[PDB]
Amino acid sequence: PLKVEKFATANRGNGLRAVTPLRPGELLFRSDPLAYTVCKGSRGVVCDRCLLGKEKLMRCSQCRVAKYCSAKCQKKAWPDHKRECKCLKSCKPRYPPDSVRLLGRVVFKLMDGAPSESEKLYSFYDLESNINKLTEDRKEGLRQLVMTFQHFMREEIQDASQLPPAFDLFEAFAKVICNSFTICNAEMQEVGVGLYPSISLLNHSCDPNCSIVFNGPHLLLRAVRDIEVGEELTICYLDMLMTSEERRKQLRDQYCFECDCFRCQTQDKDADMLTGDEQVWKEVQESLKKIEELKAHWKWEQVLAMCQAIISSNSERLPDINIYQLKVLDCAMDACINLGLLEEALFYGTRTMEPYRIFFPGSHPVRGVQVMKVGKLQLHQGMFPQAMKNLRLAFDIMRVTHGREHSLIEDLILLLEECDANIRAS
Ligand SMILES: C[S@+](CC[C@H](N)C(=O)[O-])C[C@H]1O[C@@H](n2cnc3c(N)ncnc32)[C@H](O)[C@@H]1O
Ligand SMILES: N#Cc1cccc(O)c1
Ligand SMILES: [Zn+2]
Ligand SMILES: [Zn+2]
Ligand SMILES: [Zn+2]
């Protein structure tokens, strides 16, 4: 018996609403993707199948593009990789955009696979395309994606008989633009992109009552507020560390809608987000383009060097609640963790705690994970009371946002037991 149902909203298309009253942390839906792939930066860093990092990956001998953590993952991926393999090989030096690789996997799944549980509430066929809102500039981009698909897939798809009935590639890419999910690993690093058509029923809110989290390719949808029967379920499509102007741009450009919510009408938190000297944070925002590029390719040493040049600059500095400063601190802490510089990681991480408390209100998985990471750093430096407080806080959040079905919660419980044991040993 489902706790959610599809319905026709008054002014934002189809949506999902509660069938029964829901409490924070209640599991509402879970789904594997219809189709997913590793993203450009994590290609060859994480396993194509399970999206976990490993020191060495095994490559597919035939295409040498797909890479895997284990023989089990390589073999189990074979059915869904078989047809793209021939295409990735035939186009050997060229690598397609992620959306093109994703849509290839959609087509093969729809042509060769049994009906997917991911489409139980809503199918790829049903997805919103927003075609009558696309700008001419966007349409031109989609035409180029279509031609890119036709080139990449030419070994496996020659005509319409090899596409689902009445399948339109331009419409399909339009659906991909406004319905793709960015898959994050346990550490909240972006590692892949997928389609989850049932989950695509959820409309957006800048102050949502539900949240999604990924455990490998697997998606869990949870309530993060009390929700009444009949109330619409929402998730935030966007990074919380964004101004209302930045949210406006991305919701127009990617999703073709204007947000009417209280936060957007009042520029909620914008002023605090942009405190400090404008010329400094405009420079930091510009530098974050390359820092975030380097991070997406797991280039931690280079990330750290650019972040240290800002955090410990000889020139003017920003407050930690400035969102561009905060992003830099977070990149620096993740780089330090991955480099084993744990004292320095804790320094940056602790500095993010109060800004994260402000910018991730309620129960948000990004804050839960950040608090977990800080507590773990404190635990292994022997700061047991402080670690315990943060690990408990991480559990208060993550019991709502991750829940027992998520493997990270088991890791957190272990840290809680370890820290508690240390406190009892006195
Ligand atoms: C396809 S998904 C969500 C489900 C969608 N309403 C549908 O009918 O399939 C994303 C799209 O939903 C719409 N949408 C999502 N959140 C919205 C919001 N807060 N206000 C208006 N439209 C929204 C926009 O068309 C957006 O591109
Ligand atoms: N290859 C390729 C390609 C096709 C469309 C857009 C783009 O950025 C790249
Ligand atoms: Zn694997
Ligand atoms: Zn291959
Ligand atoms: Zn809004």
Decide if 170 contacts 141 (C-beta within 8 A). no
Ligand nearest to the CA of 151: 2
Q: In what order do the strands lie in the sheet with 14-18?
A: 4-8, 14-18, 232-235, 203-204
Cα dihedral: 326, 327, 333, 338 (round 10): 170
Q: Any residues with Cβ below 6 Å from ligand 2, and which? A: 97, 144-145, 148
Numbered residues of the known binding site: 12-14, 47, 50, 60, 63, 69, 73, 81, 85, 122, 130, 179, 203-204, 237, 257
Q: How far is the CA of 9 from the centre of ligand 1 (A)?
A: 10
Q: At 370, is the secondary structure helix, strand, or coil?
A: helix
The domains spanning 34-181 and 360-426 adopt the same CATH topology: no
Distances (CA, A) of 339 to 153, 168, 180, 376, 415: 39, 46, 31, 15, 21
Which conformational region is residue 298 in: left (phi greater than 0), alpha (psi within -120 to 50 degrees), or beta? Answer: left
Cα dihedral: 59, 60, 66, 67 (round 10): -30
Give me the CATH code for the 34-181 domain, please.
1.10.220.160
Numbered residues of the known binding site for Zn(2+): 47, 50, 60, 63, 69, 73, 81, 85
Q: How far is the CA of 295 from the centre of ligand 1 (A)?
A: 30
Helices (H), 360-383: 365-380
Decide if 130 contacts 174 (C-beta within 8 A). yes
Decide if 212 contacts 220 (C-beta within 8 A). yes
Decide if 241 contacts 326 (C-beta within 8 A). yes
Burial code (b: 16+ CB inside 10 Å, e: under 16) for 10-19 equals eeeebbbbbe
Domain ranges of the chain: 34-181, 275-350, 360-426
Q: Compute the distance between CA of residue 33 and CA of residue 76 in angstroms, rounded to an integer.
A: 15
Instruction: Kindly report the protein residue whose alpha carbon is nearest to atom 18 of ligand 1.
Output: 204
Q: Is 251 in the pocket of ligand 1 (CB under 6 A)?
A: no
Resolution for this experimental structure (Å): 1.8
Give me the CATH code for the 275-350 domain, please.
1.25.40.970
Q: How far is the CA of 266 from the centre of ligand 5 (A)?
A: 9
* Ligand 1 atom nearest residue 178's Cα: 27
Burial code (b: 16+ CB inside 10 Å, e: under 16) for 235-252 equals bbbbebbbbbeebeeebe
Partners of 203 in the β-ladder: 234
Length of the chain: 426
Q: Which of 97, 85, 54 is nearest to 72 (CA)?
A: 54
At 393, list the tokens.
């806080």
Q: What is the DSSP letter of 356?
A: H
Neighbours of 207 (CB within 10 A): 15
| Mutation to probe ligand 2, out of 92, 98, 145, 170 (largest number of atoms < 8 A from CB) | 145
Q: How far is the CA of 66 from the centre of ligand 4 (A)?
A: 6
Q: Which residues contact 222 (CB under 8 A, 6 or more apart)?
A: 25, 26, 27, 28, 210, 211, 212, 213, 400, 401, 402, 403
Ligand nearest to the CA of 148: 2
Give me the CATH code for the 360-426 domain, please.
1.25.40.10
